[PDB]
Design a protein around this ligand. Sequence first.
Ligand SMILES: [Mg+2]
Lengths: 1362, 86
Amino acid sequence: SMDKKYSIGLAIGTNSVGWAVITDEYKVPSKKFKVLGNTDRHSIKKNLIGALLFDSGETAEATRLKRTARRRYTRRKNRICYLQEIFSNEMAKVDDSFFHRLEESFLVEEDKKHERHPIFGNIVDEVAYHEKYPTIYHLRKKLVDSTDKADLRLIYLALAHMIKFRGHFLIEGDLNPDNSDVDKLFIQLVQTYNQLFEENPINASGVDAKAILSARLSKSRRLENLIAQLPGEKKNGLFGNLIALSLGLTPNFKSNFDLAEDAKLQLSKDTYDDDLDNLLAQIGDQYADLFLAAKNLSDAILLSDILRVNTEITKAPLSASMIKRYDEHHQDLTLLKALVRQQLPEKYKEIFFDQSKNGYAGYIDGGASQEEFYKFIKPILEKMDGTEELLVKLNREDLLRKQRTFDNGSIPHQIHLGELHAILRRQEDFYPFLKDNREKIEKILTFRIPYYVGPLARGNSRFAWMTRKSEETITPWNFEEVVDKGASAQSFIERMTNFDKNLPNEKVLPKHSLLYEYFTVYNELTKVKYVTEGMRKPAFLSGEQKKAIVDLLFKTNRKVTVKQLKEDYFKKIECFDSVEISGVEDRFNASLGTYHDLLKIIKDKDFLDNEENEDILEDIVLTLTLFEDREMIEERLKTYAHLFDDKVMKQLKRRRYTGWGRLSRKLINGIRDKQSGKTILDFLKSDGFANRNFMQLIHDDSLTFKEDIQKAQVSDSLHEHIANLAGSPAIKKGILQTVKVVDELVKVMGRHKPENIVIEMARENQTTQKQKNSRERMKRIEEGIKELGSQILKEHPVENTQLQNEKLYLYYLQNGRDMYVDQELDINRLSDYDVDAIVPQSFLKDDSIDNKVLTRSDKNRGKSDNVPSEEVVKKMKNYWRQLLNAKLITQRKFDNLTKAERGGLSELDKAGFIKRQLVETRQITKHVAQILDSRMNTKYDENDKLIREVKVITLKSKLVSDFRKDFQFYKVREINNYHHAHDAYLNAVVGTALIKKYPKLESEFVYGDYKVYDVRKMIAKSEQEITAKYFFYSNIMNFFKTEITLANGEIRKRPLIETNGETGEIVWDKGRDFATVRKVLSMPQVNIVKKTEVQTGGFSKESILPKRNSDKLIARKKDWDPKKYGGFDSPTVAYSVLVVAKVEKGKSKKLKSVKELLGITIMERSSFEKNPIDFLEAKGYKEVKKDLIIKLPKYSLFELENGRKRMLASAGELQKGNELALPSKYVNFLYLASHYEKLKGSPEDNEQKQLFVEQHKHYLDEIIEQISEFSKRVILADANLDKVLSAYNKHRDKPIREQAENIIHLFTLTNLGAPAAFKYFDTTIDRKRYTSTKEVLDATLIHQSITGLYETRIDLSQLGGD
Amino acid sequence: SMNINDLIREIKNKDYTVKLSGTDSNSITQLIIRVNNDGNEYVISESENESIVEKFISAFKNGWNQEYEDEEEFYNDMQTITLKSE
RNA sequence: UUGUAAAAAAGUUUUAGAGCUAGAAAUAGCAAGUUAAAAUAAGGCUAGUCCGUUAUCAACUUGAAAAAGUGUC
Ligand SMILES: [Mg+2]
């Protein structure tokens, strides 16, 4: 040939990028490629098709939490250093090596430069100290309460313990009932609850919550005792489950919110914060304050239980309480030993000595948690007499407690400040420097760097923005007069603002913006319809009615419901009697929450409604979103001191808001439609007959909004464009690889650009697989069957796992009746019945339940090629309505069933099916297309219009997935990785065929600005009309088929050679072109490349292990020998290095030559990269040959004998390097055989397919020989293959479907990558590992470019010599 | 039982780096456990019939399989995880 | 839908909290336990109350680095 035009297909994913080059005839070209290196291979022919595989891109989060933990340790460390600075000179006069002894307290005695007893320096005073003060809290109480002069070392220790473990900062200011007491925090919980459920409040008037909740009963008992005081409230209702959350139980909120899957929550679980986020995702952000208030009360109960508060008043309530716990632990322990010794003396040893058991010895000495200890003794207590008290204490979770323990995070710093301050006042007269530093020392404990300041950097931190107004070290004491608080806060606001996607350069509003919330109510309010006595059609809400509703319902209540709408407004303002509401279910989801927060706080309804003040209020909400530092809130509200009273001024600051929305003020109430001068929010209020919302108004091409949005999105560099994407970091990695593939392919093709780039992008986060939707299926039936009042679930038991049978799902959805005739179906004879498409396959390929029905015979739909008949519609409409009101059919499905009442399928309907087929809805695919398009089309013409040389086309995956199933180009991902490449080829085929047949449809699926054609004008009014009108049967993939069968069994034939009539170009030859596709998919040479990468991240496993004299442990500090101190195990190899050098083999120091593989640990990496020969020489090697030091990152590829390949997993393990190209004929057999049951299609061919698997049962033996010849050659797991070969024999007579399903498991023996366990029926095959890398050192290392087309082959057996 | 994120959490608590891969609609999802941080990697991929958590439990319930000494600890740790789910 | 700032509670590790009676030991019998210090990526220079686990990476040529080249009429 001579034609040089080509097109590129791509399949972007998070672990793979498939790519293919095709020609105008859909063939994949083949080119010779230069092979560089030192071997005898100087060129290969390669097919231009393949896929790049890579490890997932990871988020910066784990890195971030480790960064913040480091800052916290650094700054806690410094608080202690500040204290010691203040103590040093006087401590020196008292004990001049005291601080030395604490510094070295960790060292073994051999290494201590001082005497081993930290506090006093001799054994007698230390032993006596500990007997007098068994815990640090005895020292703290004594120092708080006594008036004696105390040793300065003991004073230091008590201050240091409060300053190093200073407690939480969740409460602002001094502690008082309203921020700390159980009763006040309980009230706030019910106030919050009554705010969200005005119709059904909690009335807690006489309810002594402090006493009920603070008492010394178990958690479940306090829940009962509380709920017992609230008539109307079940223990497991919403309020009960909130109280259970507050008490530390684990309520299930599922049934509360009518969820399909249960929502268990526990405030103490490490998972809690995003377990709550996943709950709030479903039920609504409106409930966040409810769970917050539950959380606050939780702290107040826990702290109440920690402070055994009483009227033996101390200034040291916390230390006092811990002493009490110490003493009670002692008493119960003594009694436990006595009871054991008397009744179970053989268990004494175990419980008190055996620290590998979860008894008392494991509890104190063996790592057992309190929870674990309790689970171990409880059966033992229950066995003994006199254990009733102890068991009460246990089931109260108050037996043998320690003082340092998990509750303590609910201790406010203000408590440690209390004791800290008392102590200083005691001793400040015996030690003047304590008096002179008292406020310095309390500042060390109380000071806290504000969020809005950030790290206190000085130029060398990419995370910092803080601003100085004096170049000197910032301390807790000079902070306010050294930090420029104002300028730092300014920089904070800039960095923390998100910009509007729809219209960059505009900040987004707070999620609690009054405008956002007005906008959100009016956008919900505009789709609501109604009917009353004396009305033709369901009318929309007049803008004058929307405006009156938001003024009398939404500006008076928080939740407005269909009741107060239908009653308080319609039947009380508009003189109606009964109004049908038909756009809004139980109530309105949106709310003017912020309006009512401000109404309640500001108590000035006129002020709030004066849309003159709207900037003041939005700036207020803005400040309470950006900030929590009350000192910065005070400064940023100072201007409105004239506007508000000190009583409402105070209450404002204490109100917090968090969250951003998606939109900017300019978008909502900025840009105006040219002709109308209406902003978007202007439209949501008034719009006449057609009442459009937001997603319509943007999408609507009849206005100026969509154009200006595009004109807006205008955006420099490449990594800029990729950072700026709304996308996961995995997808951004895959996108960047995709760009690199396109560039390399352009090079390969003579630096000529392609005609088209066809893109398809995987959907992310398809993690759960199979169960989640099958509980939804059950949820829908249970609500719907009940809504009908049907007895169908008692007559026919419910089990959500056979709801995955679609026939059985539809049976229940249809209340067990024919969807097309008023008759019953037999649940036991579903096999006799037909599932039928409401809208036939010829207009659209919609196989969801939304478009399916179960009828005894699909001929009950009628004789049309359309939606079912007018006759069916008149006979069944009223039954369909019942099913609709009961939510057993969607609204959409109701409209399709009844379409014959409205003439049937209109051109408008068909035009929408066409849009549905072509238009990729996802934003991320549009931004990928723009990056590629901006990269390919760089030149402009004589009129300054961009010259679009390359068309970049986005395909919905459904097109190619449907193509595969229609023409039996089946895919089986388990066999090998080729399917990634095949998908890219198939996108190229379909996308380029589409763009040939349907040029006028360009704007729908090619990036750029094209003529936008009214698609209705392309739709023939009749089949006889067939001229320039593309479609009668709306399914755009019809031209591939030779026959299509209509919904009434009529068959329409198409030509073998499909052409574009307007342009003459051939688009598809059903002889040639399918054979081309089949031939491509069967090619064994596909370039599969696994991207090689250096490993980053943590140095090693994290457990701090006890000491061993195993030299394998890594010291935690430079001078801590792990043989004395413990350390870390299992470091991580950044990359391996090939080293050729000499070593010594004996006492002679004679030099043996060596060629080894050395793993460089992440920790060693900088050291090695700075002086590689110094590094290697210090490891043994001598005479190192620097020029042969080959960096070998993970997945470096080697080829051995017989095309056998290995990949490098580390310096001491290999992975499988080969792909098993199973012939295309065995692929479709495996798919058909193992889906023999679940077939999905016409019985005429679904029977034809089944005979195909019957008549090719011998492929079973052929496929096994394929597996076996590949394995003997490149797997080299002999014993394993012997085991699978006999296991295939033990089952040769099991059914074909079953043998095929298990043969698919067999491919993990052959897969690329790490060897993995698998099963063949019951036989289990253990993975054969490649634990030796020696053989790799004489193989061929293959450097591959990203497409694998360009390679350098290095024969390593030529190294090791001169 | 326990779900995939529970299992990942439990494995991490045993001080193993572990990654979920292949969560595209394109790729087969695979749990990968870095057994030793030196190239030994235990991979459980998801099948249509059987899930990762199901494969994990049926593989580690009976503890070690005596195949590789450098994995005896790793099998003990994974077994304790199986017990948890009850 | 990414990215970022502030804080806390545990946990681990080594040391300090003189174990006693009987015994030649081996060992047996008992007593006891709840606390603390310090480290919490080795570390780095820019020495900050900063930074140290994300992103980025075939080979070869040129660059300080963005990046640019090398295989093809
Ligand atoms: Mg440090």
